[PDB]
Every structure is written in structure tokens, then in C-alpha cells.
Ligand binder design. Structure first.
Ligand SMILES: CC(=O)OP(=O)(O)OC[C@H]1O[C@@H](n2cnc3c(N)ncnc32)[C@H](O)[C@@H]1O
Ligand SMILES: Nc1ncnc2c1ncn2[C@@H]1O[C@H](COP(=O)(O)O)[C@@H](O)[C@H]1O
Ligand SMILES: Nc1ncnc2c1ncn2[C@@H]1O[C@H](COP(=O)(O)O)[C@@H](O)[C@H]1O
Lengths: 561, 562, 285, 276
């Protein structure tokens, strides 16, 4: 059980196809009835074997602060969290919202939750009072944990609920410290199928729902991720990614701590300083770096002769496609291939260009053998022809380990899991050597700037404005953000289409929505293309935008910001 | 136009029809209800003026024997002494008044005084516990409270030591006041039509009970729809069998009869309904229009019905639950009357109904009242255009119908009920090829035992108050007598063993916390509750399992029926 | 209960077919029963399929045996006796057991059904003294035989097979039930003019108690009435006796004399079963 | 053109070569895009024009039991079935195994299935636990329907697969009745090419496979059969065949009910007694 990860860690130091398959087989034979990744892996293969190796190197590029934590200090610090939580009467399964910046105490809380068998809800720091109140309606908090920078937002969204509140940095009235109880509490003997994580994620139909992950799905699924990423024990590993999302669990937390590596974490407020971040990469001698194509696109526009990166060995991308031209520029300069790979909040990494895999540009590589990946056509028959597009699906008998339990929405489960497959809602084709190529969403779900965006959620917030009668939100091609959020608005009788109105509505949306969700374009239209029932055909809104692009024509009341 | 409306309406009542209904509809739309006060404008200005000395109320208590008769005049006087006495104790417009009494003239009196004085009345039922009442006070603080002497201690204990003015409708008690102390002349409050006069605490599927907010027109003028479906006239003696703290008392014991200048008949009884004696009193008092709930109706038809003639009875009606086709038929075959079912919620007035002129199809609540825009929507929220297709009963909001509440005192609950231009009733139905509606059931987990709406969480909560109870799930189980039974599934804490004596001990505790209708009639102890991936109780599968067990007439291993 | 059987290492176990029927539905790989050597059933017939499932698993035959309150065991598959499924075995030599026909002559031919009787000269030892009721003695003790009121046939090896009651006595869930007792209790409801209680086939409980009720003038047939009457019966009758079905009828089939044909109420139920219909005023609980 | 069947029925009362050819040509001009033989032929022609003609005369030569059903009573009885199935949550295309003796309720269920757009899998009464398990491996049941004589075989072949189960004669624990619902359910608007029947047939190479029939292939193909057979409306028509095969549909069901005849059905257990 312990022996498994020691074999895994070796696999990493020189991986290949064949040895991967052995790893695969061995996972199937783990006994995972009672499992707790902190106790069993963190504490019993790292705190014990490398307890005073650096687990985490942290740095805030604004403040300048640095902090360095060994596997020991980190395990202690996390126990003080879990002791403090338990002291405030937190039983197993209790809900804990976690909204903090990148900071050691983030990792700490992660650990305390996993160990204590709590349900953590990662909450992003750019979430609005509105978004947070939505979350509370859907899943009531037993405790919430914030930094002092976003305490007001939680305080306001909470309103008049009893919860236990906690600050990771600084004091605030009726908030508590996390390091003031004893750094000894015991494991919760968790079932491997027990819930530890809920991720609110956007869908194509309704408001965002919780994706449910267990004490093995992420803690042991992340193998697939770690394996594609090619993170080793020797590595100093950084993931450019934010605090409320899956990619952090993926590569800022699980994948590095699985293999006993040194995590590198960098915090910044506001806008990313491309140069400053890359300076901190080189300056801290990171060896493995995962960043999103959004970031990569911005990096390659720097003067890259200002860097050596002698210490950097692995570079990876995920969440959107990776332009062949990006890959090439970075290679020609630093002699490294940015290895793209694929997955969702609902899963771990499912497909990827592994270290040992020859990259074909604009291909996310081949399936990880721990997922049974199939292209299905519209009728749900399996595609076994090259260059034919279909739905990316996961075969459910046997049920892969890294796959979420389901959504907190039983209807959405009925749409996504069926005839013994889970549909990712992504479309692709494969080639003659089994390399997969991402085509796009079969959904109306949007990805601006490596953020998953649900239409209804923006449409909803739009109907909050007195002027707005109807709204349809679609994503439009943009080289920098992949997609832009555009809104079609039908106006109530009484209001007329002006730029000043468009702006007024946008500024309203800024108080209700996460920035990435606030439409960059607004177009007033007399009506929305609809089916006979009255369902919006967001498909045809998109097609129409395309034909308009090819004749460089603006809509009559289309307002760009 | 404003007085003339009611005079046109009262005629529609004496002989109604499709076409003349539509005219009534149109005329309501052209009322000026910007500043309106139903007591001044209708009670006083029409009824007290034109029929001041006709009997407004005939009252009887079947237990005590006590009886009363009040004319529209005496009642208006009586009500003014109330309003004068309230004002004397410093009651301004919008002030909250809990009213917890038996059926009694002074109840009507207070209703009037409240509406006229522009106060916010909170109808409170007489079977509410100290606990329930304290909950209410946490949610809305009382400026004054009004009780009978039978439930004064309950108010006194739930109050604790809040400042309030207190009032007794029958007898003396220390620090309680009389309501007939000041002069029977104090003036209307000029209410806006949208001003609040009523708040109703109602159960939901999700949490503790919240307030439904009604205005000086929503009930006082919405009730038209009700009165119209009911078919109450001026010449009628109209009895509604309903208890004091709920929307149906307003609907049929108060507004619908007094709108059309009828004689109200009010019958009070404590405790358990004596079907044989109540129907004897109906006949004996020559009621002519009778609303009763299907629960009552179900009990009546089991009598030997050759005991009664019902010489004087011409209209019979039901509301609040479905009305079994077999009930309708038995009563018809005997007395040659159709019991007309009709539909609505605390949140509304009557929205759908078998009107007097409408051919009844049994097990249908009839057709929508044209003063509400009723739509069946499917799951995606698109309007249903096909017979025998089930969907959500909704109210279209532009324009906003008149009898519809303002909203809940809870903004989360408003966000659920008011969506994409529709207020969802959370009821499901299908219509037929002639546009008759058939009730299917709740989209919710809300329960209706014995014509009382019951919230699961409320009872689940009270159950966790018992040391032994680790988890609880409260569902309604099919029951012919009360439509649904409140059953609790209980997971036990380690230490306590599933026994009849334990089930009882828990139940008797729940009796001190919960209104009787809420106290589970069954308690079944289980190892676990079937759950989704979320942790949410599959009340779905609890019901399916109950069904398979019913077909083998077997109880669960530790299911205790009381 | 099965856990406690194993846990206490019982070696001989007698339960009724009702129990046995319920046991075989369990997942029976939970149990070893390493200490159990004898298993027996009595009070109603023992389905061949029950016997088989228990044998295939635990390697024991559930040995059926027959008797009544009035007696001790009169017929039975003894330990040494090859069990033929659906047979209660052979007569115990301390009772003189005879199949008689309706005319009271002894049946000596295989596969012919008759009344199970006990020959009384000399009088077997385990046989009750009689009833405290002289009428009931007149019916049971006749021409030097006690009639059990059970019907059976024997085969070519003298093995007895249960057919059913020649009475109107009912056996729900291994409890013997009298019609008149339930009919009596039913007259206690003001609405009830007459009542006829019969048993209807049920695989779980052998028979269900059904009541046919004629109503007094004034009351009309409803489900709500049926229920009201049943709930009343619950306060008067042991639960096994409380009718699971109530059917309102205009009249009860009668002979020329006016005697209720409970026989024909049963036959009618059978014809209805064979076209899978429930009745027009039959209310199932 | 439903006038087709009225022309067909007459063709039957006195056929010949020439008039046959007309029938042929008229079938080619049918609109079979949306079709439902129960609604369109059974109900709309026969129940309407001869509702109180005897549809079925039934006898069990072993028990003695006999039944006589008019086109009306049969249509009602079938609706009770379909109502009951729907009540247990049966959508169109759902699989229904049907294993019963020759009995009225068999025809009833046939009708309910065709009307309700279900996929029926006729299963003969002599099929073993093994053979039935094979069937379930190949196509999973949503519901199964048996007589009480073969309930244990279904129960055992199922093991504990979730299905709705139904008995045509008698009660049994966790089996449901078919006539406790309403005497009217609405037609399923079937496409003509929609599947309503699957028949497990033996072949040379493997274990048995399913033959797939549609809402027209049998319900309208049977014409050819009915025309060769020469069955008329006036006739009392008996087909000696067993319940889980094509020849039952062919001649105990479709060919007679196409032309509005009286079906005669005889049930026996065990070996055929040719002189009785
Ligand atoms: C067991 C007991 O004492 O029963 P008891 O309550 O006195 O009733 C006696 C009646 O039980 C029935 N009965 C008893 N044993 C049976 C068996 N092996 N097979 C079938 N029926 C059986 C008969 O019908 C008896 O006449
Ligand atoms: N390599 C990739 N190329 C294109 N899209 C990707 C890639 N990796 C992930 N995605 C998208 O990211 C989605 C999941 O979003 P999230 O759950 O936020 O990681 C997938 O459904 C894809 O649509
Ligand atoms: N006639 C009726 N038939 C069926 N359900 C009804 C009927 N009237 C009321 N109900 C139910 O009772 C609810 C009204 O609750 P209340 O606010 O207590 O009157 C409705 O939302 C229905 O779901």
C-alpha cells in the first residue's frame, strides 16, 4: 500500500509505456476500503522518510515574503488546523469553505481536511458576495476559512448564519486563529469512497453544481496526472493556478506530494506580471512547471533572452489547447517541449503527452491506461475510424478510480452518465497512431482565460437588471483568452439600445459576477433564435457570429469593451 | 365604478355564467385600488349601509352550547370598539398583531378592526405549542397579542417578558385587557391597496416556516375569484368548516361571504371533530352554502346519511386536498348535490375551481379562474400545449394577478418560487381536451395531513431535540383518512435500542414541541437513510420501499404505528 | 433469530413454514450452522422449494409433520423416513389414522382425497378429552372416529398429502382462525348488516382473511368506510384475524335454507384470480 | 387509406386472383410513417364497427374453464393492462418478456404492448431457467409477465435483477395484478418502423439471436398470411400453436383480428390429446 507509492516514485525517475502498465495493474490490487492519504502517504511515506526535506517553498511577488516548510513543519501546522477545527466541534463530513490566497496555510488546511475526513469546498478569491450566497444556499457551511483580504466578502455573504470562522493571516473581530491548539490530533479512519472535496463547476444548462470527489478519487486518481506531468521526488514543482479550482488540487498539491517533491507556490494579487513571475521561476530554480496556455501565450511575448532556466527540466500545459506555435517558440529558445494534457474537475488527467511520448502539435496525446477512453458518435456507438469526431467518454465498468462520484444534481447525473459511459461533453478525433485532437465543447460551456463558465449563470445575473428581458451568453473566438463572453440582450419595452445602457448593465454585472464572467461584448437584439418550444439556439448565435467575422461586419448595436 | 362593481358582482352570484364572468373579470381590471380599504369601502359602504340590520353572523359552540347573532351593524360597531381599544394601547398602522382564538364573533370583529386600522395580523392556530409560538416571535416581534382565555398561558409563556399589549376575547386575566373598553367610533386608516395587512406562517419543503405577505387588496379583492367559484350569494347562510389560524378561514369564513353580503355561519368545537353532531348542527341551522375540507367530507360519507334531509342546503364545496370521485358520488346520490372541489394556496386566492355553472368531471379541480394566468410548464420551463402531459402549475406575472401575495419574508424562498417570469406553486397537474385540470402531486417534499401543510425539516429538527436521535427523515405516507401520514425514519445513537417504549417516549416529547398534526403517527428506526452522492435523503426510495411493503401488508423491522 | 440459532449452537430446530419461507429469502452464506443436525416444520404445508433451498445450502432436510391442538403429532416425516417433498409423511402407529369419504366409508385407494380421522376404539393416548362444547363434539366424534376436519390423499407407499380444510377454518401465518368470530366482531360496527369471512390463497401467509359485507340501508360502499370498520376490528381482534381485504356486496350467496355458502365465495374468488381481476368494491390493505 | 382494411375484409368474403392484385397495389399506397395497429385497426375499425362481436372464444381442456370476450370487453381489458404497465413506469421501447399459457389475458397483453409501443419478447412456457437466463444476458427486461404456473422459473432466472413482474392468473408475493388500473390508456404514436417484437430464434452456428419486428412488419405483413389462409370476418378461427412463437402472432392473433373474425383459443398442458 505504502510499497505501491515507492514503486510509483521509481517509475517517475525514468518512465515508459511498459512500466506504466505495471503501475496500472498494481493500483487495481490496492485495498482501498479504509484509506486516508495524509496518514497513509503524507505521514507514512514522506513525513517519516523525508520529514525535514522542504515540502513547500512559498513566495508573494507583491509583498516579497518567502516561507519554507519541511514535510514535518507542514504536518504539524496542519494538525494545529485540525485540532483547532475539532476544538470548534467539527465532526467528519462537515462542510468547510476555503477561500485564501496562495499561502502555506492553504496546504495546511487541505491536509487538515483530508486527515479529518471533512468536506472542503475550494472557494476562489475573486468570487462575489452573490456567488458566495448561491453556494451557501446549495451547501450550508459548518466552518469557513479565509485570509483577511477577503473576510468582508465571506462576512457579508454569510449574513446571519452561525459558523466557525478562521483567518490564516491577521486578526479580525469574531474570526479565530488556526495555529493556537496542539499539533497532535489523530487520523479520521475514512472509507476510500468517503467524500472530502466538493467543487462548484459550471454546466451548459443551469446554475453551477457540486462535483463530488472522494478520499481516493483525487488523492489516488492524481497518479494519472502525476504520471503525465512527469513530476519526480527530485523536483521543485510549480503550478501557475489559483486557489479555488481543481488544477490546484491536481498539480499544486496532490501530484507533487504523491512523489515527495518540493512544491513551489507563488502568490500574486491582481494582474499577473509575466516577467516578475518568470524571474521568480528561474530565481527559485523550479524544475517542473505547469502553466495554462493563457499564461504560456503571454510568456512567449516576453524578451526571453533575459532567462537561462538552466534548472528547468519539465514544462506542461492544461485546460485549453496549446497552439503549435507557442510550443515551438519555447522549444527553440529553452530546448523544452510544453507538454499539453487533458482533464476536467469531474476527473483527473485522462489524456496527455507523457515525458516519453513524441509530441504531435495540437494533440493532447494518448489516453492514460487507468481510464477507458472512447469516442462515441451521436447514437452512442463506438468510433473506430481515424479523423472522425465524437464525444470523449469514460467507460464505467470497471469504474475508473479518479472519476468523481457524481454531481449534487441528480438530473445532471442522468444526462452525463448513461449506457455505461460518462460523457465529458468534449469532442475530439483520434489519428492512425491513437493521438487525440481536441475539437471543442459539444456544450455551450465557455472557457475564457482557462476559466470554465456556465451560460445560465451569466444570463441569470443579467435578468437582475431592470432593463433586461432576455439574455443569451455565448463564447466567441479570441486568440488571447481562447473565448470571450458575449451577451445577446433583448430589452424590455421602455428602454432603447445605447452604449450607455450596455455599460450600466456591465457595471452592474461586475458587482454580481466574477470578472472572467462579465461579458466583454454586449449586443442588443430584438429577439433570440429559438426552437419551437422556446429554447435558445446558442448554436446558431455562434454560427452567425462566424459568418459576420468573415465579412468583418459588426452587429447594429454590438458594443465591445 | 368602485362600489358599482360589487353590486354588479352580487348579481353574477345569484345566477352565474361563463360570459358574465368574463365581464366581472374585465371590471376588476378597471377598479382604482391605489388607496383602498375593504372595511370602509365594502363592509361599511355597501353592506352596513344597504343591509346593516341583516344577520352578518350566526355563531354556535357545539361543546358549550353558547350561541350568538350579529347584524352587519352590530358587527361594525363591535369592530370599531376593538380598533378604538387597540389604538388606545398605541397601535399605529403596520403594527403586528398575533391572533390566536377559537371560532367566535370577536374573531370577525378583530379581523375587521385590523383591516380597517391597517395593522398586520398574524393568524395563529389554537393548537400551536409554546415552542412554535416562540419561533414565530423570533421571526416577527409582536406589538400586540390577542387570545381567548383557553390559550392565554401558552401566549404568556411563549412571550416570556416581551413588552406587548395583550387582549382576551372571553373573560378576565391578570395583565390582559378587554376589547370593548373604548367608543364604537374610530376612523379608517387610508391604506394603499399594496399595504400589508396579513402575514401567514407557512411550511415549506426546505426549512422552518416563513411568512406569506398579503395586502389590503390581495385577499380582500382576490377572494372574488374564490367567492365566484364557491358560488356564495347574499341570500346564503354560509358555513366554512375550518380552524382559525389559516388561509381558509380568511377565504371562506370571512372574505368570500362578507363580499356578497351573506349571513356567515360559524361553528366552534374543541378537540376532535364529532362528524354526526356537526352535520346535525349544519342541518339544524339551515346552512345553504357549505365549504368543508375533503378530510371532513371523507368522514361524513361514512355516516348513515338517511339521518339527514338537508332541506335548505344548495351549495357544497371542498378545498385544500384532492376530492376522491367516490366521495363526490356518495353525497350526490343521497342529497342530490355535487361537492365542488377547487384549488389554491396561502400564497393565493382560489386559482382553479368547479364553478357552480360548470359540469363537474370527478377528480378534477375544474378550470382556471380567468383573473389568474395559470400555465402548466414542463421541466425546462416551456409552456405545455398537449393534453395528459404533467407539469408545474404556475402563475404568469406580467400582469401580476390581484390575489397573489407580495412574496415571502424570505428572499431565498422568493428566488425559488419566482423564476423566469412565473410564480411556481410547486404543484403538478395535467389538463384534458376540455381544459379541465387534474392534480398529480407535489414537486416538493411538503406534506398535507388532515388538510394541514407540514414541513419535513421542522419535524426532523424537533426530532434531533431527543437525545436518542442521530438522524431523521420525515415523509408523508398514503392514508385514505388524512391523505398523508407523517412518518419519521430515525437512525439511533449508540446506546439506545429500538423499542416500542422508546418510539413512544420520543413521540410524547414531540407532542410538547409540535402541533398535533405534525407529530409523527409512525416512527421507524433504521440503520441508515438511503442517500445520494450529495448526502441528500432519497425520500423517493423511502416511498417506493413503503409501497412494496404495503403490498405484503408488512411493517418494517422496527416500525411502530400509533 | 437465525444468527442466534447459530450463535447458541442449537442442534434441533422446529419453525413453521411461515418462518421457513422468510429464512430462505436471506443471503444464507452468512451462516454455517455447523452444530445444527435436525430441522423440522409443522402447522401448514411445507413448500418443496423451501426444503430444497435449505438442503442445497446447509445439507439438511426440513422434515414436515402434522397435528392439531386436539392431538399430538399424528403424521410426520420421521428421522429415518425418506422424505417425499410436499408430503407430511406417514401416520404415527400410536394413532389409527384413516381417510374416510363423505359417506363415512374407509378409502383404500391411492390419490383419492378424504377426511383425516382417528379411530377411537381403542382410544389413542395423545387425543384430547373432547371440547367444552357438546355441539362441536357431535360433529367431530362420529361413528367411532374423530374427524380432524382436514383433507388429504395417500400414495402407493402410504405417504399422506395435505389438500386443505373441509371446514371453513382459516390459517393465516400459522394461526387458526374462526369465521364466526370475525363475522361477530364485524356486526359490532353499526354499518354492518351481515358478514362472511373466508380465506384467500397467499404464498406468504397460506391464507388471507377476507370479509364480504352487506351494508345496512343508509351507509354506502366506500374505501373510507371499509377502513373505518377495519380500524374498529383492530381494537376487537387479534391482528392475524383483522381482514386484509374488505368487499361490500349486495348479498351473500345462500342455500335454500338461508345458510351462507362460504364455499362459493371461495370458488368465485378463484375464477376472478384466473383472469387477474380485483373486485368492484374489494378494498385491499 | 384505412379504407384499405374495409376493402381487404371484403376481398376475404370471396377472393380471387384479380381482386388480390388490387389489394397488393393498395398496400403500396399506405401511409405507414406513423402507425399503431391497435388504435388504427383494432379500435378504429373493429371496436367501432363490431364492438360486440365475439373477439375470443377460449377454453382450457384440462381445467374446463371457458371465456367469451367481445371486441369491446377485450379492448377494455387490454387498456387496464397498458394503464397498469405505464403506472409501473414503462416507457416506449421498454422490454417486456411474456411467458404465459393460452389465455384471454395473453391477447390482452399483446394489445396493451402494441398500443403502448413496448418491445415484447414472447417466451414459451416450456423454457428452462437456463434458457431464460441466456435471454436476459442478451436483452435485459424492464418488465416480465407470467402465469402463476411459471412464475418460479422467471423468478429464479431473474435472480435479483430489478424488474416489474405481473401475474395473469392469481397472486404471488412481489407480483402485481394487471386489472387494478383504468380501462383507458392513450395510444403511443409509433413510427411504422418502430420495434414492438423481438423473437429469439435458433440458428446454425451459435446460441439464439433476436429477430426484430416493427409496428407494420407483423401488424401489416400478416395480410399476406390472412390472404393465403382465407380467414374472414364471419369465421371462428382456431390456430393450434403455442404462446412464445411467431405462429401465434401469425394466426392466433394478427391474421384473425385483421379481418374482425372470432378467435378461438384452446389451452392444454402436457402432451397433445389428438382425439379430445
Ligand atoms: C400445528 C397445530 O397445532 O395447528 P393448530 O393451530 O391446532 O391447527 C391445526 C391445523 O393445522 C394444519 N396443519 C398442521 N400441520 C400441518 C401440516 N404438516 N401440513 C398442513 N397443514 C397442517 C391443519 O389444517 C390442522 O387441522
Ligand atoms: N488540452 C486541452 N485542450 C483543450 N481543452 C482542454 C484541454 N484540457 C482541458 N480542456 C478543457 O477543460 C475542460 C474542463 O474544465 P475544468 O473542469 O475547469 O478543468 C474540459 O472539458 C475541456 O473542455
Ligand atoms: N383541491 C386540491 N387538490 C389537491 N391538492 C390541493 C388542493 N388544494 C390544495 N392542495 C394542495 O395544498 C396546497 C395548498 O396549501 P395551503 O397553503 O395550506 O392551502 C396546494 O399547493 C396543493 O398542493
Amino acid at each position: 500500500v505504502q510499497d505501491f507509492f515507492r514503486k510509483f516514485i521509481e517509475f517517475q525517475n525514468s518512465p515508459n509505456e511498459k512500466s506504466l502498465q505495471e503501475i496500472v495493474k498494481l493500483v487495481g490490487q490496492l485495498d482501498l476500503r479504509r484509506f486516508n492519504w495524509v496518514r497513509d502517504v503524507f505521514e507514512d511515506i514522506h513525513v517519516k522518510e523525508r520529514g525535514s526535506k522542504t515540502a513547500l517553498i512559498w513566495r508573494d511577488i507583491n509583498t516579497g515574503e518567502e516561507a519554507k516548510l519541511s514535510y514535518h513543519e507542514l504536518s504539524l501546522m496542519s494538525n494545529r488546523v485540525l485540532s483547532t477545527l475539532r476544538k470548534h466541534g467539527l465532526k467528519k463530513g462537515d462542510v468547510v469553505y476555503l477561500m485564501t490566497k496562495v499561502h502555506p496555510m492553504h496546504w495546511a488546511v487541505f491536509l487538515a481536511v483530508i486527515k479529518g475526513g471533512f468536506v472542503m469546498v475550494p472557494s476562489a478569491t475573486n468570487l462575489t458576495v452573490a456567488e458566495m450566497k448561491y453556494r451557501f444556499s446549495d451547501l450550508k457551511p459548518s466552518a469557513i476559512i479565509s485570509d483577511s483580504l477577503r473576510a468582508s466578502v465571506m462576512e457579508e455573504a454569510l449574513g446571519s448564519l452561525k459558523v466557525e470562522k478562521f483567518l490564516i493571516d491577521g486578526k479580525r473581530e469574531t474570526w479565530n486563529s488556526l495555529e493556537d491548539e496542539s499539533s497532535n490530533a489523530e487520523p479520521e479512519d475514512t472509507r476510500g469512497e468517503d467524500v472530502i472535496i466538493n467543487y462548484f463547476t459550471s454546466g451548459t444548462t443551469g446554475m453551477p453544481k457540486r462535483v463530488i470527489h472522494t478520499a481516493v478519487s483525487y488523492p489516488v486518481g492524481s497518479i494519472t496526472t502525476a504520471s503525465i506531468v512527469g513530476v519526480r521526488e527530485s523536483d521543485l514543482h510549480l503550478n501557475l493556478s489559483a486557489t479555488g479550482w481543481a488544477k490546484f488540487a491536481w498539480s499544486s498539491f496532490f501530484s507533487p506530494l504523491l512523489v515527495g517533491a518540493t512544491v513551489v507556490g507563488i502568490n500574486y494579487e491582481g494582474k499577473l506580471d509575466t516577467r516578475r513571475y518568470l524571474g521568480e521561476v528561474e530565481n527559485l530554480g523550479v524544475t517542473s512547471f505547469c502553466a495554462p496556455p493563457t499564461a504560456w501565450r503571454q510568456f512567449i511575448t516576453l524578451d526571453l533572452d533575459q532567462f537561462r532556466f538552466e534548472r528547468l527540466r519539465s514544462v506542461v500545459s492544461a485546460g485549453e489547447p496549446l497552439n503549435p506555435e507557442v510550443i515551438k517558440i519555447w522549444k527553440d529558445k529553452f530546448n523544452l517541449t510544453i507538454r499539453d494534457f487533458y482533464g476536467q474537475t469531474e476527473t483527473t488527467a485522462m489524456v496527455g503527452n507523457f515525458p516519453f511520448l513524441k509530441v504531435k502539435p495540437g494533440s493532447m496525446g494518448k489516453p492514460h491506461p487507468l481510464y477507458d477512453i472512447r469516442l462515441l458518435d451521436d447514437e452512442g456507438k463506438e468510433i473506430t475510424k481515424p479523423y472522425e469526431v465524437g464525444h470523449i467518454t469514460v467507460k464505467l465498468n470497471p469504474r475508473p478510480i479518479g472519476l468523481f462520484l457524481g454531481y449534487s444534481d441528480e438530473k445532471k447525473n442522468m444526462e452525463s452518465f448513461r449506457e455505461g459511459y460518462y460523457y465529458t461533453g468534449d469532442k475530439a478525433y483520434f489519428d492512425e497512431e491513437g493521438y487525440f485532437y481536441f475539437v471543442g465543447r459539444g456544450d455551450d460551456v465557455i472557457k475564457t482565460s482557462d476559466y470554465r463558465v456556465g451560460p445560465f449563470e451569466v444570463e441569470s445575473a443579467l435578468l437582475e437588471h431592470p432593463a433586461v428581458a432576455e439574455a443569451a451568453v455565448v463564447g466567441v473566438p479570441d486568440t488571447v483568452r481562447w473565448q470571450l463572453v458575449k451577451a445577446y440582450i433583448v430589452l424590455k419595452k421602455g428602454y432603447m439600445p445605447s452604449k450607455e445602457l450596455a455599460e450600466e448593465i456591465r457595471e452592474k454585472m461586475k458587482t454580481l459576477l466574477s470578472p472572467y464572467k462579465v461579458p466583454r461584448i454586449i449586443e442588443f437584439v430584438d429577439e433570440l433564435p429559438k426552437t419551437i418550444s422556446g429554447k435558445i439556439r446558442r448554436v446558431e448565435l455562434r454560427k452567425r457570429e462566424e459568418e459576420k467575422r468573415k465579412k468583418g461586419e459588426v452587429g447594429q448595436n454590438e458594443y465591445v469593451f
